[PDB]
Design a protein around this ligand. Structure first.
Ligand code: HEM
Ligand code: HEM
Ligand SMILES: C[C@]12CC[C@H]3[C@@H](CCC4=CC(=O)CC[C@@]43C)[C@@H]1CC[C@@H]2C(=O)CO
Ligand SMILES: C[C@]12CC[C@H]3[C@@H](CCC4=CC(=O)CC[C@@]43C)[C@@H]1CC[C@@H]2C(=O)CO
Lengths: 470, 462
């Protein structure tokens, strides 16, 4: 009664034809649209002619729920070779994202309490909030210098500097001075290295190393250089804290990586490695969903008014105890789910499943690469009535919200990312109206992360006309 | 009783690794060895994965005999895309090698009588004989100036110029003056261009234009430039003969191309296209086996004597009538067959078959590309006892298919054999040929199969 694997419809692509297109185009910007169309054509599940091993593409919660059941003690993902290649080339340990098996669980169990748990959030949220305030304040100052009490900009650079600053405070306990000031040359280089790293990832990611070694030798060279610059940026941060904590163990909280070095449950190389993942990880992944949310508010001003109404009503509580924003801004929290439904930074969830199972009435063998395309998932009209509509209310009225993945491998940085996102939006909403003429869809572009190919011109208009009061 | 097509064993590799390998290596020099060890391993027949299109590889006479029986009235080979693309880019017509169908046959039928018929041969062979006599006489003059009455050299340059000179006289009635003299800048440019054309052909024939068009745009530019140089050489030859004939029609034989022009059974554009195939196709194809024959004679001094004695015996009659060379040197003719068994200039015959057939008890559907690999065919120790032995005698008695078969068999075969034969004849009469370099020469595939090195040969005057 259950259909066999080969009964499953097939993506009509040769791994080779896409291999060669990636070599030619130096990327794969339209992946999300290719998969989306393929589900449009073949229905909610299909397989892909991969270089041997089975691979299946799904888009329904049902399938995620099932997929979580099959998570062993050690859930597993496809090795990301270019990234792992770098660590081995320079002698570095791999952090959680690149670890599988017991080394992974061991790390993860020693990182959850200080990065993801609610006790941790209670401690870093006020640090984030200070940065969120300083962003708004800086922007309001520029706004009130203008005769019309507004500023019209590409907000992207300043949002990226916001996430570098908020993350570095939460992770290392240091203010970099990047909010309300110009980018440092270190921050610009870091941003560029991340972008080159991500792009070159897409180029090396869809072929085996044996082939790419001689087909794309200078893409490897590019990718390692990018990593080298990312690693220098992170090692600078680690050296400063490590020397500081060698001489004085503070009595109070000074961030997430301090908790890890004080406890010293993980080894130094293991802390270094996980700290690089948190530093590299905390910039683009949070920045683009913020930009997208600003964009959707800008062109859904009625939804914007509702969210402001809420944020104005909680201003007093959140001024007094910043932690209360997590519970007192449910509609804004819901807006974020809405942004990640439409614009999922992580395009697909992925497991190399360790046991036979059944998705969609098809038999899925042990060792099958299963991928969950969140882009299509979020646009299923039967589960998301009017999926084109940006409607945060839809979450107030289970496995529908899974942009951070699921289970024990669920995003380690979820609560930091949410904190950063929510608090910046909260303070912006209290002080500014946000507007655009660009009322039409921003094309998303896939380059390991899913990101806008365009930044809209947004206008921030002071409601009040006072630098502090909202 | 008939195994269906997919029963048949399968080459391990895939066409994408292949083309990437070629993009990286800038060639495919081992194609012969690879296919050979594939035959050992998988048997006397296998299919290659073209991902839909059907391709079979074979190595047995048995299989060639039935490949011919399924020759139509219009036997088809695969579109050699790089070569046809040059013709299109410059506005030229295709000659017989690149034609299929009724147009192929219309050209071919008007080409055989003057290019390949025994009557054609008797007219051009004495010309070829004059050039081959100049070769040995030039060499004898140099050889005798040395105190040990011998010259040791790499002969490849001079032999290539011989074939240029011999083909040109036979084809156009012109002596270029390249035998017993220096290469000219035209001849060296010609040889260089031919070498780049062949190399670049290998770089393009193994992928669709739609991939090579951006995988290898520089290789396309290289290819067409080589062709330009080749067409310029050939066009100079054509413009000359064309002008001479417009002013005076000979009453005597002045070569192959003249007969085509005088008869005007084919169009001007058609004569030109075929004249370029002949001109471009009569240098490297003939020169390499000639070298390999020189080399194998040097290795096997016992077989060289037998051939010498034959040529000394027939010298007088051949000087009287050079046309008797065909009939009076049966051992030297056999020699050539033996050179071509071991060192086939063209590595595979090819037919895109037009009816269904069966080979090795497999069903082979219409539209399949059947390739016969002559390098392996010739080394079947089961069919040529002591396969590495250079033995002309085994040909005195469908094993001899290095010029292919059917209506499509090599159009230049008699001109090629005549050039090879006469040169060896005049050399054997006057010199012993020797080397210390006894080891097998590695062959290399760049569209023509050819020696990768050139052994140093000593010519000692008798
Ligand atoms: C909105 C922003 C973010 C999104 C949408 C996101 C999404 C994801 C997703 C889908 C996964 C895979 C989960 C799974 O396989 O179940 C993941 C893993 C991970 N994320 Fe995030 N993430 C974000 C922000 C961050 C930040 C800021 C950090 C660093 C502080 C971070 C660190 C990580 C790490 C270390 C993992 C690996 C988890 C493991 O293997 O144990 N993420 N994230
Ligand atoms: C010993 C030297 C040569 C060898 C081994 C050789 C071999 C071949 C082979 C194997 C073919 C394919 C035949 C088939 O598919 O049945 C061929 C075709 C052809 N050869 Fe040669 N060839 C040689 C010399 C020449 C020369 C000197 C010329 C021109 C002067 C020439 C002109 C051609 C032409 C025009 C074709 C195409 C015939 C057609 O498709 O109708 N060949 N040759
Ligand atoms: C989100 C993501 C997994 C988590 C990473 C993120 C890119 C930034 C990043 C860098 C790290 O060193 C740690 C993991 C991480 C935060 C990836 C981009 C796409 C990928 C996925 O979507 C897998 O589901
Ligand atoms: C011999 C050959 C077919 C005939 C051509 C030859 C290469 C040189 C050449 C150029 C021409 O303009 C006419 C045909 C020809 C003489 C080819 C090299 C390999 C190929 C084959 O192996 C046929 O199967």
């Amino acid at each position: 009664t259950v259909l066999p694997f080969e009964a499953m419809p097939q993506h009509p692509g040769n791994r080779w034809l896409r291999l060669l297109q990636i070599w030619r185009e130096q990327g794969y910007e339209h992946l999300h649209l290719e998969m989306h169309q393929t589900f449009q054509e073949l229905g909610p599940i299909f397989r892909y002619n991969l270089g041997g091993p089975r691979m299946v593409c799904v888009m329904l919660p049902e399938d995620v729920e099932k997929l979580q059941q099959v998570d062993s003690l050690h859930p597993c993902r496809m090795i990301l070779e270019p990234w792992v290649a770098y660590r081995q080339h320079r002698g570095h340990k791999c952090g959680v994202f690149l670890l599988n098996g017991p080394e992974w669980r061991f790390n993860r169990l020693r990182l959850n309490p200080d990065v993801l748990s609610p006790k941790a959030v209670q401690r870093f949220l006020p640090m984030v909030d200070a940065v969120a305030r300083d962003f708004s304040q800086a922007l309001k100052k520029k706004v009130l210098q203008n005769a019309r009490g507004s500023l019209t900009l590409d907000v992207q650079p300043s949002i990226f500097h916001y996430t570098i600053e908020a993350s570095n405070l939460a992770l290392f306990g240091e203010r970099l001075g990047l909010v309300g000031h110009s980018p440092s040359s270190a921050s610009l280089n870091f941003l560029h290295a991340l972008e080159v790293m991500f792009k070159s990832t897409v180029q090396l990611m869809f072929m085996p190393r044996s082939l790419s070694r001689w087909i794309s030798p200078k893409v490897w060279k590019e990718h390692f250089e990018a990593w080298d610059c990312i690693f220098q940026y992170g090692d600078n941060c680690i050296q400063k804290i490590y020397q500081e904590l060698a001489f004085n163990r503070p009595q109070h909280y000074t961030g997430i990586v301090a908790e890890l070095l004080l406890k010293a449950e993980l080894s130094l190389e293991a802390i270094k490695a996980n700290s690089m993942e948190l530093t590299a990880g905390s910039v683009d992944t949070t920045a683009f969903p913020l930009l997208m949310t600003l964009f959707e508010l800008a062109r859904n001003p009625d939804v914007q008014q509702i969210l402001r109404q809420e944020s104005l009503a909680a201003a007093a509580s959140i001024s007094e105890h910043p932690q209360k924003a997590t519970t007192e801004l449910p509609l804004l929290r819901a807006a974020l789910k809405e942004t990640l439904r439409l614009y999922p930074v992580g395009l697909f969830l992925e497991r190399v499943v360790s046991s036979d199972l059944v998705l969609q009435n098809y038999h899925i063998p042990a060792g099958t690469l299963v991928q969950v395309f969140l882009y299509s998932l979020g646009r299923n009209a039967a589960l998301f009535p009017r999926p084109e509509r940006y409607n945060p209310q839809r979450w107030l009225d289970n496995f529908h919200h899974v942009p951070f993945g699921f289970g024990m491998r669920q995003c380690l940085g979820r609560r930091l990312a949410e904190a950063e996102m929510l608090l910046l939006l909260h303070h912006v909403l209290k002080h500014f109206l946000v507007e655009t003429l660009t009322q039409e869809d921003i094309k998303m572009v896939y380059s390991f992360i899913l990101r806008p190919g365009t930044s809209p011109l947004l206008t921030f208009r002071a409601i009040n006309h006072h630098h502090h009061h909202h």
